[PDB]
């Protein structure tokens, strides 16, 4: 393992985490909304019919803490709790999540038109799927 | 914008997924995890922060935050002086965690990518930094 591979990893890490944190700010959502969005996005990611436990585990979230945000989400109609207990997005929940994601994506399009040319977007299109491959790596 | 929107939806997902994978390779349970987030937040802000600027910086709620600090102090990772800083052990945990994510990424990039894939990433990477600094 070369040191140059170590500096490529350091760079890739800072770039991908730094871009992810900017996209966080583009949610345009106060503390309460932001905490809620994370839970919501997590449920949709896991396929939308999930135990509190599975959700806590996937978000390395604490059982105690999720219990309370799940409580807020139901009061606000964004999730629906059945049946073991499983939570789902209500269609208000979807409209909200997809909503925020549509904002962040509009934002990014405008970054990409202002920051990059066509051949640079084409590189990002080739490179982006390799991020997924590293994200899904099993050794 | 159809392609444009396609690219941006993919790109967002690709970045935030690998960043999710990165914080898993902390290999921390929930309690140790929730903590690194405040540690990094404090480090990122220069490390002489009050709870409020902190809570504010990070889109973060104060119940949550107050409770994390007390764990952090008791664990020996932060020092209190109404302002808050990282102890050396806290600087050590944080940077140790960063190192280990890097070590993990290296193995990942050597195992599942070929040489030209890694070079595309070296080439595309910086573009990610520009989109992040788009103020």
PDB file of C-alpha atoms in Angstrom:
ATOM      1  CA  UNK A   1       0.000   0.000   0.000  1.00  0.00           C
ATOM      2  CA  UNK A   2       1.767   3.181  -1.260  1.00  0.00           C
ATOM      3  CA  UNK A   3       1.741   6.399   0.653  1.00  0.00           C
ATOM      4  CA  UNK A   4       0.372   7.949  -2.618  1.00  0.00           C
ATOM      5  CA  UNK A   5      -2.638   5.668  -2.309  1.00  0.00           C
ATOM      6  CA  UNK A   6      -2.920   6.888   1.312  1.00  0.00           C
ATOM      7  CA  UNK A   7      -2.993  10.541   0.069  1.00  0.00           C
ATOM      8  CA  UNK A   8      -5.566   9.615  -2.634  1.00  0.00           C
ATOM      9  CA  UNK A   9      -7.811   8.107   0.060  1.00  0.00           C
ATOM     10  CA  UNK A  10      -7.389  11.209   2.341  1.00  0.00           C
ATOM     11  CA  UNK A  11      -8.380  13.455  -0.558  1.00  0.00           C
ATOM     12  CA  UNK A  12     -11.301  11.347  -1.725  1.00  0.00           C
ATOM     13  CA  UNK A  13     -12.537  11.162   1.895  1.00  0.00           C
ATOM     14  CA  UNK A  14     -12.376  14.945   2.430  1.00  0.00           C
ATOM     15  CA  UNK A  15     -13.984  15.698  -0.912  1.00  0.00           C
ATOM     16  CA  UNK A  16     -16.917  13.362  -0.583  1.00  0.00           C
ATOM     17  CA  UNK A  17     -17.575  14.317   3.082  1.00  0.00           C
ATOM     18  CA  UNK A  18     -17.175  17.986   2.370  1.00  0.00           C
ATOM     19  CA  UNK A  19     -19.573  17.824  -0.578  1.00  0.00           C
ATOM     20  CA  UNK A  20     -22.067  15.780   1.604  1.00  0.00           C
ATOM     21  CA  UNK A  21     -21.967  18.486   4.364  1.00  0.00           C
ATOM     22  CA  UNK A  22     -22.684  21.311   1.837  1.00  0.00           C
ATOM     23  CA  UNK A  23     -25.677  19.360   0.532  1.00  0.00           C
ATOM     24  CA  UNK A  24     -26.738  19.174   4.203  1.00  0.00           C
ATOM     25  CA  UNK A  25     -26.796  22.994   4.379  1.00  0.00           C
ATOM     26  CA  UNK A  26     -28.813  23.033   1.116  1.00  0.00           C
ATOM     27  CA  UNK A  27     -31.706  21.257   2.868  1.00  0.00           C
ATOM     28  CA  UNK A  28     -32.585  24.808   4.129  1.00  0.00           C
ATOM     29  CA  UNK A  29     -34.113  23.251   7.213  1.00  0.00           C
ATOM     30  CA  UNK A  30     -33.724  24.274  10.904  1.00  0.00           C
ATOM     31  CA  UNK A  31     -32.527  21.699  13.584  1.00  0.00           C
ATOM     32  CA  UNK A  32     -35.950  20.059  14.111  1.00  0.00           C
ATOM     33  CA  UNK A  33     -36.615  19.612  10.365  1.00  0.00           C
ATOM     34  CA  UNK A  34     -33.135  18.374   9.738  1.00  0.00           C
ATOM     35  CA  UNK A  35     -33.215  15.699  12.431  1.00  0.00           C
ATOM     36  CA  UNK A  36     -36.516  14.572  10.986  1.00  0.00           C
ATOM     37  CA  UNK A  37     -35.359  14.467   7.432  1.00  0.00           C
ATOM     38  CA  UNK A  38     -32.522  12.079   8.332  1.00  0.00           C
ATOM     39  CA  UNK A  39     -34.984   9.677   9.987  1.00  0.00           C
ATOM     40  CA  UNK A  40     -37.324   9.982   6.951  1.00  0.00           C
ATOM     41  CA  UNK A  41     -34.629   9.477   4.452  1.00  0.00           C
ATOM     42  CA  UNK A  42     -33.366   6.503   6.336  1.00  0.00           C
ATOM     43  CA  UNK A  43     -36.820   4.832   6.238  1.00  0.00           C
ATOM     44  CA  UNK A  44     -37.150   5.362   2.484  1.00  0.00           C
ATOM     45  CA  UNK A  45     -33.664   4.055   1.939  1.00  0.00           C
ATOM     46  CA  UNK A  46     -34.438   0.814   3.877  1.00  0.00           C
ATOM     47  CA  UNK A  47     -37.487   0.242   1.741  1.00  0.00           C
ATOM     48  CA  UNK A  48     -40.021   2.037   3.812  1.00  0.00           C
ATOM     49  CA  UNK A  49     -41.488  -0.701   6.100  1.00  0.00           C
ATOM     50  CA  UNK A  50     -39.016  -0.957   8.921  1.00  0.00           C
ATOM     51  CA  UNK A  51     -38.604  -1.651  12.630  1.00  0.00           C
ATOM     52  CA  UNK A  52     -37.344   1.120  14.840  1.00  0.00           C
ATOM     53  CA  UNK A  53     -34.398  -1.235  15.600  1.00  0.00           C
ATOM     54  CA  UNK A  54     -33.337  -1.731  12.055  1.00  0.00           C
ATOM     55  CA  UNK A  55     -33.469   1.989  11.522  1.00  0.00           C
ATOM     56  CA  UNK A  56     -31.505   2.784  14.672  1.00  0.00           C
ATOM     57  CA  UNK A  57     -28.869   0.242  13.579  1.00  0.00           C
ATOM     58  CA  UNK A  58     -28.556   1.620  10.042  1.00  0.00           C
ATOM     59  CA  UNK A  59     -28.190   5.162  11.313  1.00  0.00           C
ATOM     60  CA  UNK A  60     -25.963   4.028  14.207  1.00  0.00           C
ATOM     61  CA  UNK A  61     -28.594   5.918  16.072  1.00  0.00           C
ATOM     62  CA  UNK A  62     -29.358   5.289  19.664  1.00  0.00           C
ATOM     63  CA  UNK A  63     -32.584   3.341  20.446  1.00  0.00           C
ATOM     64  CA  UNK A  64     -33.541   5.928  23.130  1.00  0.00           C
ATOM     65  CA  UNK A  65     -33.213   8.828  20.659  1.00  0.00           C
ATOM     66  CA  UNK A  66     -35.019   7.493  17.616  1.00  0.00           C
ATOM     67  CA  UNK A  67     -37.948   6.659  19.903  1.00  0.00           C
ATOM     68  CA  UNK A  68     -38.474  10.348  20.438  1.00  0.00           C
ATOM     69  CA  UNK A  69     -38.023  11.541  16.803  1.00  0.00           C
ATOM     70  CA  UNK A  70     -40.378   8.760  15.706  1.00  0.00           C
ATOM     71  CA  UNK A  71     -42.798  10.134  18.186  1.00  0.00           C
ATOM     72  CA  UNK A  72     -42.556  13.615  16.584  1.00  0.00           C
ATOM     73  CA  UNK A  73     -42.913  12.302  13.030  1.00  0.00           C
ATOM     74  CA  UNK A  74     -46.191  10.490  13.804  1.00  0.00           C
ATOM     75  CA  UNK A  75     -47.673  13.612  15.571  1.00  0.00           C
ATOM     76  CA  UNK A  76     -46.825  15.498  12.344  1.00  0.00           C
ATOM     77  CA  UNK A  77     -48.270  12.813   9.986  1.00  0.00           C
ATOM     78  CA  UNK A  78     -44.960  12.246   8.137  1.00  0.00           C
ATOM     79  CA  UNK A  79     -44.715   8.609   9.167  1.00  0.00           C
ATOM     80  CA  UNK A  80     -47.211   5.820   9.755  1.00  0.00           C
ATOM     81  CA  UNK A  81     -46.602   3.262  12.499  1.00  0.00           C
ATOM     82  CA  UNK A  82     -48.019  -0.318  12.357  1.00  0.00           C
ATOM     83  CA  UNK A  83     -48.516  -3.294  13.129  1.00  0.00           C
ATOM     84  CA  UNK A  84     -43.394  -6.053  16.102  1.00  0.00           C
ATOM     85  CA  UNK A  85     -43.747  -2.384  15.065  1.00  0.00           C
ATOM     86  CA  UNK A  86     -42.915  -1.095  11.633  1.00  0.00           C
ATOM     87  CA  UNK A  87     -42.799   2.491  10.361  1.00  0.00           C
ATOM     88  CA  UNK A  88     -43.502   3.803   6.913  1.00  0.00           C
ATOM     89  CA  UNK A  89     -43.582   7.080   5.121  1.00  0.00           C
ATOM     90  CA  UNK A  90     -47.034   8.577   4.861  1.00  0.00           C
ATOM     91  CA  UNK A  91     -47.516  10.281   1.457  1.00  0.00           C
ATOM     92  CA  UNK A  92     -47.007  13.641   3.278  1.00  0.00           C
ATOM     93  CA  UNK A  93     -43.707  12.027   4.356  1.00  0.00           C
ATOM     94  CA  UNK A  94     -42.775  11.233   0.762  1.00  0.00           C
ATOM     95  CA  UNK A  95     -43.889  14.618  -0.540  1.00  0.00           C
ATOM     96  CA  UNK A  96     -41.673  16.174   2.129  1.00  0.00           C
ATOM     97  CA  UNK A  97     -38.538  13.972   1.601  1.00  0.00           C
ATOM     98  CA  UNK A  98     -38.622  13.984  -2.189  1.00  0.00           C
ATOM     99  CA  UNK A  99     -39.356  17.665  -1.864  1.00  0.00           C
ATOM    100  CA  UNK A 100     -36.099  18.382  -0.016  1.00  0.00           C
ATOM    101  CA  UNK A 101     -34.154  16.142  -2.339  1.00  0.00           C
ATOM    102  CA  UNK A 102     -35.570  17.988  -5.309  1.00  0.00           C
ATOM    103  CA  UNK A 103     -34.249  21.261  -3.775  1.00  0.00           C
ATOM    104  CA  UNK A 104     -30.781  19.840  -3.111  1.00  0.00           C
ATOM    105  CA  UNK A 105     -30.570  18.469  -6.644  1.00  0.00           C
ATOM    106  CA  UNK A 106     -31.714  21.715  -8.231  1.00  0.00           C
ATOM    107  CA  UNK A 107     -29.018  23.410  -6.176  1.00  0.00           C
ATOM    108  CA  UNK A 108     -26.379  20.876  -7.520  1.00  0.00           C
ATOM    109  CA  UNK A 109     -27.393  21.337 -11.128  1.00  0.00           C
ATOM    110  CA  UNK A 110     -26.827  25.053 -10.673  1.00  0.00           C
ATOM    111  CA  UNK A 111     -23.400  24.377  -9.040  1.00  0.00           C
ATOM    112  CA  UNK A 112     -22.500  22.146 -11.914  1.00  0.00           C
ATOM    113  CA  UNK A 113     -23.485  24.692 -14.506  1.00  0.00           C
ATOM    114  CA  UNK A 114     -21.595  27.433 -12.778  1.00  0.00           C
ATOM    115  CA  UNK A 115     -18.432  25.504 -11.654  1.00  0.00           C
ATOM    116  CA  UNK A 116     -17.753  22.983 -14.376  1.00  0.00           C
ATOM    117  CA  UNK A 117     -17.883  22.561 -18.142  1.00  0.00           C
ATOM    118  CA  UNK A 118     -19.514  19.742 -20.105  1.00  0.00           C
ATOM    119  CA  UNK A 119     -16.445  17.488 -20.193  1.00  0.00           C
ATOM    120  CA  UNK A 120     -16.102  17.897 -16.434  1.00  0.00           C
ATOM    121  CA  UNK A 121     -19.728  16.833 -15.794  1.00  0.00           C
ATOM    122  CA  UNK A 122     -19.011  13.850 -18.054  1.00  0.00           C
ATOM    123  CA  UNK A 123     -16.065  12.835 -15.777  1.00  0.00           C
ATOM    124  CA  UNK A 124     -18.296  13.125 -12.743  1.00  0.00           C
ATOM    125  CA  UNK A 125     -20.870  10.995 -14.457  1.00  0.00           C
ATOM    126  CA  UNK A 126     -18.131   8.298 -15.088  1.00  0.00           C
ATOM    127  CA  UNK A 127     -16.667   8.673 -11.609  1.00  0.00           C
ATOM    128  CA  UNK A 128     -19.809   8.782  -9.504  1.00  0.00           C
ATOM    129  CA  UNK A 129     -20.763   5.218  -9.929  1.00  0.00           C
ATOM    130  CA  UNK A 130     -17.283   4.185  -8.604  1.00  0.00           C
ATOM    131  CA  UNK A 131     -18.283   5.849  -5.292  1.00  0.00           C
ATOM    132  CA  UNK A 132     -21.210   3.427  -5.126  1.00  0.00           C
ATOM    133  CA  UNK A 133     -18.884   0.514  -5.771  1.00  0.00           C
ATOM    134  CA  UNK A 134     -16.615   1.569  -2.886  1.00  0.00           C
ATOM    135  CA  UNK A 135     -19.737   2.177  -0.715  1.00  0.00           C
ATOM    136  CA  UNK A 136     -20.968  -1.389  -1.368  1.00  0.00           C
ATOM    137  CA  UNK A 137     -17.549  -2.994  -0.971  1.00  0.00           C
ATOM    138  CA  UNK A 138     -17.303  -6.281   1.013  1.00  0.00           C
ATOM    139  CA  UNK A 139     -13.817  -7.627   1.824  1.00  0.00           C
TER     140      UNK A 139
ATOM    141  CA  UNK B   1     -31.872  19.557 -17.743  1.00  0.00           C
ATOM    142  CA  UNK B   2     -33.283  16.013 -18.034  1.00  0.00           C
ATOM    143  CA  UNK B   3     -29.712  14.654 -18.249  1.00  0.00           C
ATOM    144  CA  UNK B   4     -28.665  17.408 -15.811  1.00  0.00           C
ATOM    145  CA  UNK B   5     -31.202  16.356 -13.200  1.00  0.00           C
ATOM    146  CA  UNK B   6     -30.290  12.649 -13.805  1.00  0.00           C
ATOM    147  CA  UNK B   7     -26.603  13.524 -13.148  1.00  0.00           C
ATOM    148  CA  UNK B   8     -27.292  15.579 -10.039  1.00  0.00           C
ATOM    149  CA  UNK B   9     -29.633  12.965  -8.489  1.00  0.00           C
ATOM    150  CA  UNK B  10     -27.082  10.219  -9.124  1.00  0.00           C
ATOM    151  CA  UNK B  11     -24.188  12.326  -7.918  1.00  0.00           C
ATOM    152  CA  UNK B  12     -25.854  13.321  -4.689  1.00  0.00           C
ATOM    153  CA  UNK B  13     -26.715   9.780  -3.935  1.00  0.00           C
ATOM    154  CA  UNK B  14     -23.255   8.489  -4.814  1.00  0.00           C
ATOM    155  CA  UNK B  15     -21.493  10.989  -2.563  1.00  0.00           C
ATOM    156  CA  UNK B  16     -23.734  10.682   0.486  1.00  0.00           C
ATOM    157  CA  UNK B  17     -23.735   6.904   0.318  1.00  0.00           C
ATOM    158  CA  UNK B  18     -19.986   6.600   0.382  1.00  0.00           C
ATOM    159  CA  UNK B  19     -19.948   9.155   3.242  1.00  0.00           C
ATOM    160  CA  UNK B  20     -22.459   6.919   5.129  1.00  0.00           C
ATOM    161  CA  UNK B  21     -20.128   3.931   4.417  1.00  0.00           C
ATOM    162  CA  UNK B  22     -17.234   6.043   5.686  1.00  0.00           C
ATOM    163  CA  UNK B  23     -18.798   6.641   9.136  1.00  0.00           C
ATOM    164  CA  UNK B  24     -19.656   2.899   9.471  1.00  0.00           C
ATOM    165  CA  UNK B  25     -15.948   2.029   9.145  1.00  0.00           C
ATOM    166  CA  UNK B  26     -15.499   3.829  12.449  1.00  0.00           C
ATOM    167  CA  UNK B  27     -16.906   0.521  13.621  1.00  0.00           C
ATOM    168  CA  UNK B  28     -18.550   2.184  16.605  1.00  0.00           C
ATOM    169  CA  UNK B  29     -21.730   1.354  18.363  1.00  0.00           C
ATOM    170  CA  UNK B  30     -24.367   4.197  18.640  1.00  0.00           C
ATOM    171  CA  UNK B  31     -22.985   5.757  21.849  1.00  0.00           C
ATOM    172  CA  UNK B  32     -19.379   6.088  20.571  1.00  0.00           C
ATOM    173  CA  UNK B  33     -20.767   7.188  17.185  1.00  0.00           C
ATOM    174  CA  UNK B  34     -23.010  10.087  18.249  1.00  0.00           C
ATOM    175  CA  UNK B  35     -19.891  11.365  20.031  1.00  0.00           C
ATOM    176  CA  UNK B  36     -17.395  11.501  17.077  1.00  0.00           C
ATOM    177  CA  UNK B  37     -19.889  13.752  15.281  1.00  0.00           C
ATOM    178  CA  UNK B  38     -19.598  16.404  18.078  1.00  0.00           C
ATOM    179  CA  UNK B  39     -15.807  15.893  18.288  1.00  0.00           C
ATOM    180  CA  UNK B  40     -15.413  16.491  14.537  1.00  0.00           C
ATOM    181  CA  UNK B  41     -17.823  19.433  14.752  1.00  0.00           C
ATOM    182  CA  UNK B  42     -15.684  20.971  17.470  1.00  0.00           C
ATOM    183  CA  UNK B  43     -12.465  20.294  15.581  1.00  0.00           C
ATOM    184  CA  UNK B  44     -13.904  21.691  12.324  1.00  0.00           C
ATOM    185  CA  UNK B  45     -14.802  24.935  14.128  1.00  0.00           C
ATOM    186  CA  UNK B  46     -11.322  25.528  15.635  1.00  0.00           C
ATOM    187  CA  UNK B  47     -12.029  23.898  18.996  1.00  0.00           C
ATOM    188  CA  UNK B  48     -12.851  26.833  21.394  1.00  0.00           C
ATOM    189  CA  UNK B  49     -16.582  26.823  20.894  1.00  0.00           C
ATOM    190  CA  UNK B  50     -19.585  27.447  23.117  1.00  0.00           C
ATOM    191  CA  UNK B  51     -22.421  24.934  23.046  1.00  0.00           C
ATOM    192  CA  UNK B  52     -24.665  27.451  21.165  1.00  0.00           C
ATOM    193  CA  UNK B  53     -22.340  28.258  18.221  1.00  0.00           C
ATOM    194  CA  UNK B  54     -21.879  24.550  18.097  1.00  0.00           C
ATOM    195  CA  UNK B  55     -25.573  23.600  18.201  1.00  0.00           C
ATOM    196  CA  UNK B  56     -25.985  26.371  15.559  1.00  0.00           C
ATOM    197  CA  UNK B  57     -22.996  25.524  13.306  1.00  0.00           C
ATOM    198  CA  UNK B  58     -24.221  22.001  12.824  1.00  0.00           C
ATOM    199  CA  UNK B  59     -28.087  22.241  12.419  1.00  0.00           C
ATOM    200  CA  UNK B  60     -28.291  20.620  15.809  1.00  0.00           C
ATOM    201  CA  UNK B  61     -30.631  20.569  18.772  1.00  0.00           C
ATOM    202  CA  UNK B  62     -29.588  21.640  22.261  1.00  0.00           C
ATOM    203  CA  UNK B  63     -31.148  18.815  24.334  1.00  0.00           C
ATOM    204  CA  UNK B  64     -29.173  16.391  22.158  1.00  0.00           C
ATOM    205  CA  UNK B  65     -26.006  18.559  22.343  1.00  0.00           C
ATOM    206  CA  UNK B  66     -26.022  19.295  26.063  1.00  0.00           C
ATOM    207  CA  UNK B  67     -26.194  15.540  26.740  1.00  0.00           C
ATOM    208  CA  UNK B  68     -23.389  14.591  24.346  1.00  0.00           C
ATOM    209  CA  UNK B  69     -20.970  17.124  25.939  1.00  0.00           C
ATOM    210  CA  UNK B  70     -21.409  15.644  29.432  1.00  0.00           C
ATOM    211  CA  UNK B  71     -20.590  12.161  28.091  1.00  0.00           C
ATOM    212  CA  UNK B  72     -17.608  13.588  26.284  1.00  0.00           C
ATOM    213  CA  UNK B  73     -16.257  15.363  29.379  1.00  0.00           C
ATOM    214  CA  UNK B  74     -16.771  12.289  31.650  1.00  0.00           C
ATOM    215  CA  UNK B  75     -15.037  10.172  28.888  1.00  0.00           C
ATOM    216  CA  UNK B  76     -12.117  12.668  28.822  1.00  0.00           C
ATOM    217  CA  UNK B  77     -12.439  13.796  25.223  1.00  0.00           C
ATOM    218  CA  UNK B  78     -13.389  17.443  25.808  1.00  0.00           C
ATOM    219  CA  UNK B  79     -12.454  20.094  28.315  1.00  0.00           C
ATOM    220  CA  UNK B  80     -14.734  22.829  29.662  1.00  0.00           C
ATOM    221  CA  UNK B  81     -13.399  26.371  30.200  1.00  0.00           C
ATOM    222  CA  UNK B  82     -19.014  28.201  29.291  1.00  0.00           C
ATOM    223  CA  UNK B  83     -16.639  27.189  26.321  1.00  0.00           C
ATOM    224  CA  UNK B  84     -15.630  23.777  25.123  1.00  0.00           C
ATOM    225  CA  UNK B  85     -12.443  22.205  23.590  1.00  0.00           C
ATOM    226  CA  UNK B  86     -10.984  18.800  22.715  1.00  0.00           C
ATOM    227  CA  UNK B  87      -8.521  17.189  25.058  1.00  0.00           C
ATOM    228  CA  UNK B  88      -5.544  15.429  23.457  1.00  0.00           C
ATOM    229  CA  UNK B  89      -7.413  12.071  23.836  1.00  0.00           C
ATOM    230  CA  UNK B  90     -10.279  13.603  21.913  1.00  0.00           C
ATOM    231  CA  UNK B  91      -7.946  14.934  19.253  1.00  0.00           C
ATOM    232  CA  UNK B  92      -6.481  11.395  19.265  1.00  0.00           C
ATOM    233  CA  UNK B  93      -9.924   9.666  18.880  1.00  0.00           C
ATOM    234  CA  UNK B  94     -11.011  11.988  16.110  1.00  0.00           C
ATOM    235  CA  UNK B  95      -7.782  11.775  14.082  1.00  0.00           C
ATOM    236  CA  UNK B  96      -7.491   8.080  14.791  1.00  0.00           C
ATOM    237  CA  UNK B  97     -10.962   7.693  13.298  1.00  0.00           C
ATOM    238  CA  UNK B  98     -10.087   9.699  10.193  1.00  0.00           C
ATOM    239  CA  UNK B  99      -6.888   7.597   9.705  1.00  0.00           C
ATOM    240  CA  UNK B 100      -8.884   4.384   9.899  1.00  0.00           C
ATOM    241  CA  UNK B 101     -11.452   5.538   7.390  1.00  0.00           C
ATOM    242  CA  UNK B 102      -8.540   6.395   5.078  1.00  0.00           C
ATOM    243  CA  UNK B 103      -6.965   2.998   5.669  1.00  0.00           C
ATOM    244  CA  UNK B 104     -10.330   1.434   4.862  1.00  0.00           C
ATOM    245  CA  UNK B 105     -10.769   3.492   1.678  1.00  0.00           C
ATOM    246  CA  UNK B 106      -7.284   2.398   0.499  1.00  0.00           C
ATOM    247  CA  UNK B 107      -8.082  -1.283   0.840  1.00  0.00           C
ATOM    248  CA  UNK B 108     -11.462  -0.615  -0.829  1.00  0.00           C
ATOM    249  CA  UNK B 109      -9.889   1.228  -3.797  1.00  0.00           C
ATOM    250  CA  UNK B 110      -7.250  -1.514  -4.276  1.00  0.00           C
ATOM    251  CA  UNK B 111      -9.699  -4.382  -3.922  1.00  0.00           C
ATOM    252  CA  UNK B 112     -12.622  -3.290  -6.085  1.00  0.00           C
ATOM    253  CA  UNK B 113     -11.163  -0.702  -8.510  1.00  0.00           C
ATOM    254  CA  UNK B 114      -8.543  -1.005 -11.153  1.00  0.00           C
ATOM    255  CA  UNK B 115      -5.746   1.481 -11.693  1.00  0.00           C
ATOM    256  CA  UNK B 116      -7.510   3.603 -14.234  1.00  0.00           C
ATOM    257  CA  UNK B 117     -10.594   3.782 -12.015  1.00  0.00           C
ATOM    258  CA  UNK B 118      -8.491   5.191  -9.206  1.00  0.00           C
ATOM    259  CA  UNK B 119      -6.896   7.669 -11.558  1.00  0.00           C
ATOM    260  CA  UNK B 120     -10.447   8.827 -12.691  1.00  0.00           C
ATOM    261  CA  UNK B 121     -11.224   9.405  -9.073  1.00  0.00           C
ATOM    262  CA  UNK B 122      -8.012  11.353  -8.558  1.00  0.00           C
ATOM    263  CA  UNK B 123      -9.040  13.404 -11.609  1.00  0.00           C
ATOM    264  CA  UNK B 124     -12.789  13.786 -10.696  1.00  0.00           C
ATOM    265  CA  UNK B 125     -12.237  14.268  -6.958  1.00  0.00           C
ATOM    266  CA  UNK B 126     -11.279  17.918  -6.932  1.00  0.00           C
ATOM    267  CA  UNK B 127     -14.462  18.735  -8.877  1.00  0.00           C
ATOM    268  CA  UNK B 128     -16.314  17.612  -5.814  1.00  0.00           C
ATOM    269  CA  UNK B 129     -14.429  20.228  -3.759  1.00  0.00           C
ATOM    270  CA  UNK B 130     -15.408  22.985  -6.206  1.00  0.00           C
ATOM    271  CA  UNK B 131     -19.102  22.073  -6.070  1.00  0.00           C
ATOM    272  CA  UNK B 132     -18.829  22.124  -2.245  1.00  0.00           C
ATOM    273  CA  UNK B 133     -17.287  25.623  -2.255  1.00  0.00           C
ATOM    274  CA  UNK B 134     -19.930  27.004  -4.628  1.00  0.00           C
ATOM    275  CA  UNK B 135     -20.544  30.260  -2.542  1.00  0.00           C
TER     276      UNK B 135
END
